[PDB]
Amino acid sequence: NVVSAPMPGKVLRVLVRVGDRVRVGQGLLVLEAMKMENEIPSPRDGVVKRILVKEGEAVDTGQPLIELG
Amino acid sequence: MLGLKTSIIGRRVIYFQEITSTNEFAKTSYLEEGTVIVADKQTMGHGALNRKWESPEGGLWLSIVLSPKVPQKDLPKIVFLGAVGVVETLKEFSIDGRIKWPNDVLVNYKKIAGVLVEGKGDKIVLGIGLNVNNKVPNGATSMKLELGSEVPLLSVFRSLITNLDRLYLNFLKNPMDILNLVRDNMILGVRVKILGFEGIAEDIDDFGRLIIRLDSGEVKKVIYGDVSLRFL
Ligand SMILES: Nc1ncnc2c1ncn2[C@@H]1O[C@H](CO)[C@@H](O)[C@H]1O
Ligand SMILES: O=C(O)CCCC[C@@H]1SC[C@@H]2NC(=O)N[C@@H]21
């Protein structure tokens, strides 16, 4: 499935690489929002099929971020 | 044996001779609220906005597990909690530290501490690095440098934890109290430059956004992270 933004924020960094198998609740990427560096968790285990965003990108609530396999 | 007397923060402290990062550990472990992570030295020390942090032995490097349950609109104040917490500890030791928007405390404009807050869904990690007796980077200072002698590491810890606990309880009562403490304790009147206009750092708003006064007189608000800022 698709993992969208839990809130607005700029991308600090991406923890995972494509093809990387993810763990439920594991760290996918980091968004600097409300003076915090927010780590975004994987709703399911899986594999990094697609990294939909870049570092330094401004994302908004619900925007597509990661697509797993 | 620590003899702490707090309600939430400091009810459990976990100490490490050394570690990559207290913040990482705090994030990656299941820990009750108010638990403190403290190490003699960190090797993979972290800083705000993907920067690095020197954590040599002799300083205080800790992480606090918090679970406030507050509107998103109040989450930007958590960093302030830590800074003001530090300011008040230095005040006890007769050191005058001021806040540099929005996560650094300074003494005579030399960095003596920094805050880093990280999110983990329900979990919120407050990380604070303060220079006590450790060796420090050029341009930075320490309590030992400020006071000209060794400062009791435990005493600084007990003091800081104690201020952060109180500040936390009042934060759960009225998250608006911190803003004033900050406004009343941060460097102001300084001409700054935004990269990517220039003006005066005259204040912050109720979201903790820096308020710059342009030369014409217009006002501009800065969101942390969104722009690069510098002192002139
Ligand atoms: N232990 C430290 N004490 C004071 N300043 C530091 C320390 N480690 C890193 N810094 C500075 O803090 C800045 C990041 O907040 C960096 O530009 C860096 O020079
Ligand atoms: O000024 C900054 O950039 C923030 C520095 C935060 C440093 C502390 S040391 C305790 C905690 N563990 C870390 O890895 N970082 C914070």
Q: Where are the domains of chain B?
A: 1-187, 188-232
CATH value of B188-232 in 3.40.50.2300, 2.40.170.20, 2.30.30.100, 1.10.3720.10: 2.30.30.100
Q: Do B118 and A37 touch (CB under 8 A)?
A: yes
In 3D space, the residue among A53, A49, A61, A8 whose CA is nearest the CA of residue A29 turns out to be A53
Pocket of ligand 1 contains residue B54 by CB under 6 Å: yes
Question: How many Å apart are CA A31 and CA B146, to the nearest integer?
Answer: 36
> What's the DSSP call for residue A8?
-
Q: Which residues of B154-167 are buried (b: 16+ CB within 10 A; e: fewer)?
A: eebbbbbbbbbbeb
CATH hierarchy code of domain B1-187: 3.30.930.10
Rounded to 5 degrees, what are φ and ψ at A14? -110, 120
Q: The domain at A1-69 falls in which architecture?
A: Beta Barrel (2.40)
Residues 6+ apart with CB under 8 A from B138: none
Nearest to A9 by CA among A29, A34, A26, A28: A34
- Ligand 2 mutation target, pool B53, B79, B104, most atoms within 8 A of CB: B53
| Cross-chain Cβ contact B226/A38 below 8 Å | no
Give the resolution in Å: 2.7
Tokens 């005058």 sit on residue: B96
Cα separation values, B11 from B4, B8, B32, B64, Å: 8, 6, 9, 11
Q: Chains A, B: CB contacts under 8 A, how many? A: 48
Domain residue ranges in chain A: 1-69
Q: Looking at the DSSP assignment, which residues form a beta bridge with residue B60?
A: B130
Structure determined by? X-ray
CA of B71 to the centre of ligand 2 (A): 25
The rounded distance, in Å, linking the Cα atoms of A60 and B76 is 17
